[PDB]
Write a protein that binds this DNA or RNA. Sequence first.
DNA 1: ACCGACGTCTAAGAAACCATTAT
DNA 2: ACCGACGTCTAAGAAACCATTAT
Lengths: 468, 468, 258, 258
Amino acid sequence: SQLAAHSTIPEPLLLFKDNRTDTHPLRGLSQYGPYSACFNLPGQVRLAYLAPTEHMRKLDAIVRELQNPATPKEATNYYVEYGGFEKVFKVPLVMPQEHLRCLALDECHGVAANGNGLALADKIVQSMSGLFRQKHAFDVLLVYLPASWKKCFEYDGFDLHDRIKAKVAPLNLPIQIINDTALTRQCRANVMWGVSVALYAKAGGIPWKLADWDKDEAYIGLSYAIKKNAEGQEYTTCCSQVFDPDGTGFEFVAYDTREFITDRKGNPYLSYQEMQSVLSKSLHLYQSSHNGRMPRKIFIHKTTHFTEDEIQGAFDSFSSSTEIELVQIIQSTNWYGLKVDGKKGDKPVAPASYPVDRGLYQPLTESECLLWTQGSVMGVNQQNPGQPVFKEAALTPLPNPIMLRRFSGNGGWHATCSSILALTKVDWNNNTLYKKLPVTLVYSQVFADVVKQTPEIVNEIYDYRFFM
Amino acid sequence: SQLAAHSTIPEPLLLFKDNRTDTHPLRGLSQYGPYSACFNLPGQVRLAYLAPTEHMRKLDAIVRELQNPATPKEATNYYVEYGGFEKVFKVPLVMPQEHLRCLALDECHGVAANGNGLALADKIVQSMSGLFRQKHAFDVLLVYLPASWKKCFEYDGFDLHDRIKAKVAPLNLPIQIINDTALTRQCRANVMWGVSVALYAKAGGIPWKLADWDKDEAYIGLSYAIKKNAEGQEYTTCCSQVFDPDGTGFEFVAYDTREFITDRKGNPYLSYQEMQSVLSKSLHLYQSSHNGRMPRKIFIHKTTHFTEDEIQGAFDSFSSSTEIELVQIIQSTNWYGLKVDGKKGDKPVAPASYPVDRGLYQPLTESECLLWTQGSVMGVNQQNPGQPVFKEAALTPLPNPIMLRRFSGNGGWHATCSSILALTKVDWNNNTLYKKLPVTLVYSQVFADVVKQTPEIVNEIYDYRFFM
Amino acid sequence: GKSFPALRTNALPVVTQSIRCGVVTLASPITFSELKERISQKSPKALLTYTEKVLFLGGEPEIRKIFSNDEINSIGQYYIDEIAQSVAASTFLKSFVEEAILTALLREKPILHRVRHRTHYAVIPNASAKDDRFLDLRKAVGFKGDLGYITGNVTNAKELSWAEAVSIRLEERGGKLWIMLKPEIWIKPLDRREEATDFIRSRRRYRFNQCSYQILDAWIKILFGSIGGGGTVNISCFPDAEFKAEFEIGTRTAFSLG
Amino acid sequence: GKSFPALRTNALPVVTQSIRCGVVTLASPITFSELKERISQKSPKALLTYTEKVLFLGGEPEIRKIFSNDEINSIGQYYIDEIAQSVAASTFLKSFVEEAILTALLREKPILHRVRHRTHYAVIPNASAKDDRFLDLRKAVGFKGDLGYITGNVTNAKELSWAEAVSIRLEERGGKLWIMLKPEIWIKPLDRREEATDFIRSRRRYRFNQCSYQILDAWIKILFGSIGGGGTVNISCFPDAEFKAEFEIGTRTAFSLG
DNA sequence: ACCGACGTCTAAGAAACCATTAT
DNA sequence: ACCGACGTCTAAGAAACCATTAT
Ligand SMILES: [Mg+2]
Ligand SMILES: [Mg+2]
């Protein structure tokens, strides 16, 4: 008949320049400035170009428009005006000189015509060679892939994005890919906000971070990818770790699960040895980045369920004093929720005009809970201060929640729900308020695609800046 | 007459393709492959010419015999068979087309007859103007000066090599200068190995790097050059830095000491604010290449001693957690060493047939010691597998040790001499086994000479690939 | 629960706890594939499943149509006590219970029954669109208080047809059984659903919280006949036959306060 | 030291710790330049230096020759205690003690004394080339076990002369005083060393580690007169005079083990 | 005198594509 | 009367200019 009492958690706060809090990312960025601007790293954001000589004009056009103000056109309820790169980020955006504008060889067009994607990525890096010598002179490289290369973008078992990112990752060169999507979109402010924030993050800056974070907690997310070949299937599993250091930092890294190279798995669930190995690597990274202390309590998030050996390895890799939480994330569920307003004035109990608020979680049983990572948020709207805003109104008429399964734990759902919801906003690669999934899962998925595409880069920890 | 016990440092290991070690550089390139071939960078080494039309066939001959195998004829104890560019570097060396071959203006002959070197350098750089817009069509340019221009090469206060290198440094086009020395030498293996390694390095690749090198350490070398004029003289002191990025790769850069242009000094020693400026600038590169992390320990090498002012500047320019190492390298000393073998069967102790080993360091007092950068090395011989090789045998009958004075340090000599010995082989401009001086001082001296020749290129950071 | 706003789900509680089914014992071993083949070939007026013996809901004449007298050894009765635990533990029991509940709900009522992608759907018939019981659903779908069509022809297609429907699913959580409803626009034929995706998207684009609440209430009223009556609606499948299943499912959807 | 191979340097330890020299207190003021001018004009049979007062080793009749009776006020003695750090801190004392040690070394012994670029050389005479005390040095510079010449003329030269020589330097490191040797081919006249660089390069081309060891041992024997005696050789400067300097220099070159 | 091949049925997600941009 | 021009002297390196090619 009636379920147990639910609860809603406040929309989490983002930290900005001089320790200021703002719920709206773009509004806070325009009004206070980026978090790393107070420590002025980078002092400037230097750019480099990677495009054919026939498409340099689009690149200089997009940088120029990045340097100039722009106003929102679509989704104006949450979308604020762009005030220009140097005004918003308090740090200039330099337009690259003649020696920092790289030209791809003409062989790239022929390779694209012949459909060899791997040769295309090799040719792009071969073109970008000189930037390796010049990498001291700039920070971030802009790469433009024309629409004439579409046939080599993503076919069976190949991905140009993952290949190029994997090839340029060891070179310690953050790059940005620009397609016709960023250039032929009606809402220029979306392109401007997203590109500017991504460039600032790639140059080494921190656009924002959660306000109230405990530095004694670690977050782990494991996701898997599917590789198809004639022999069978191989499951590429990679782990992502999120935590903050003791001071003025933000660690967002991903690393592979494989103990040795050429260890093939046909199922997503990892063995006892593999769980011990990966969780110990996570502990070692946290140890290095935390002056030798161990985490008081650890969160592990996974797409699939925890088998018994995995639980045993998780319990055995850490000590007894450190609490361990295992949480299942399920995207698809049979439940949906409807918001009903209460009795106010003369209007009786009636359904609200806007859907259920984001942050509302429903405890289903002693081990399962439904968390609404999608919903309406108060205090964000620009047109009407009192009107709620729902991001995916043009996609989902109603929010569809996700379901959490607790495999081990004695505490309540408040802590895990707060952590999961707070971890949905620090994806600097998007330009919207929040993500449906926590950032650990999406970063693990991206690195899983990257590792599956190129398996030669394993056993090296990599930061988010190289794969966003 | 009994000194402190000496210790010998094992010969440092060089890293090659697929992360595998070999001491002998040429042997490693022949049998294992270059380190940068792992990333297939450069995919190809396109080539360009700049010679008078009377000396074109010399350029074609040198590139051809670069592309063909050659056998050693002198110092055969060390040099191995040369197998051509493609077999050794696993990348092709592409000959220039019709439009990638350049002809110097006929006015160059008249300028050389007039003896004005600066006009000759200007004419060469202006003749190479046609290559600037086709820079995308090649990577490394060869320039040829025939023997008829000897008299305009080096006179008082002038250097054609340094002038041309300074002029082409901001144009962002590596050059390789060849004269009749390369074409009229008996030992073809010498020239072919040197030119091949130099061309591959100037193509942007990493021929080889040290095997066991820490990424938390940085090394700084300071040298000075003297220019004299009617009024007096001033000191052109510069700086250089060797270190490896967070990812796999190599970058080796040098920069000027002068905080502002037209600052004049009459002694090599640097002021407090000068040390602060230079060390803070070096810190910027270090943080830029390592995602803003601090170096755990810093090494500074100078050809002159450190006054109290320099020590205070160095100590205040870094954080408290980073240990500060100041070492003065005294090339010429009054000491030399003789090697004595122990009792071997019936034969008693007797002088060895070959000189002292390279890697032997003798602690003299609390802060002063001699390390043998010159000596005999075992395991690199080709004719006789068991007989050591001492390379400077054709000119010096005995090695001359270099003398090291410390000004700051808690740890023992082991790390200091180990680092100094390791840095002696990373000079890709050197076709022999090693250098007497660490590569930091070599690049500092070369850049000091270049800046002394042309002081208009100050405050711009330049890597080795432009001055090797 | 202590305060507002309210969260209204799609889950209808099930009050029944025991199902009395029949056991058909085979002298010769039987498999699921052959049982399904016989079901398809004979088209019986009963529901059957195979965990370890053929469990059926319906009448003996039916399973004697499916099975010859030689094959059948004996016929008995089976009590599925603690239905929730058995459904959670046994997959075939879950499918059987879901099918039985659907067949009990869609009896003697003008609602088409269809299946898509292992899921159960209740589709409004085309011919009986103007029925008076559909007035609430017609009001819920229209715009600005105008009466709206429930079924019709899709735009710009040869003979593609569409009709508004509800998906019925069974879910077990913590020892309690829930029935799940999700409004969804059915397309006939089933295999041509891809050709009308833009049409469905256009139809549901502004189906916000208000319209969704109205549609859910209308579907509850259509399926059960009463809404918010405070009681339970009793449905039975094959009431004439000896082996029948009756269910007690409430009309008020599970909700949460506080 | 604990193991082999062994390292043999060219440094001879100096065991002396104090020098008892005399001072020349003169009423009128004295500078180094005119002091050296008087030395050149008079050619004293003694060594003189100027730190703050005129310091000498030798006999008083000499400085009475170089200074008239009116100029000299009084004569006393100076105790140079802690010779090592005094030599390190004071340059004049370093050069003075180095000259005194060399003059003590080359007394009543048939080796010429020469100076080039303010560095001291011990050069064997042409006239006493075939002396028996030079047999070891003749053997060392020989080829295939044959006796080798230790003095001669430079090939393709008009009047150039060459001889085998050793350079002696004084060095102070860490409170210990060392005497350094280095074999070198001396050329007479000094200013025509340009014309014989090919000759020196050819002569020193094959003087490898083994041959250099023999040359160093032969020169140690020539300089000190004993080898491997396990003790120290005492050398003195002007033993007949009142103010004399005596030194205790070992014969075994400083060595180090693993 | 068995543990491998294959059928059924749940849940849950991932991969080559499609499509809109916030009552 | 104090500090600024000259001389001496050590160590030590670089304006430069010739070589010969590894027992
Ligand atoms: Mg990158
Ligand atoms: Mg060079």
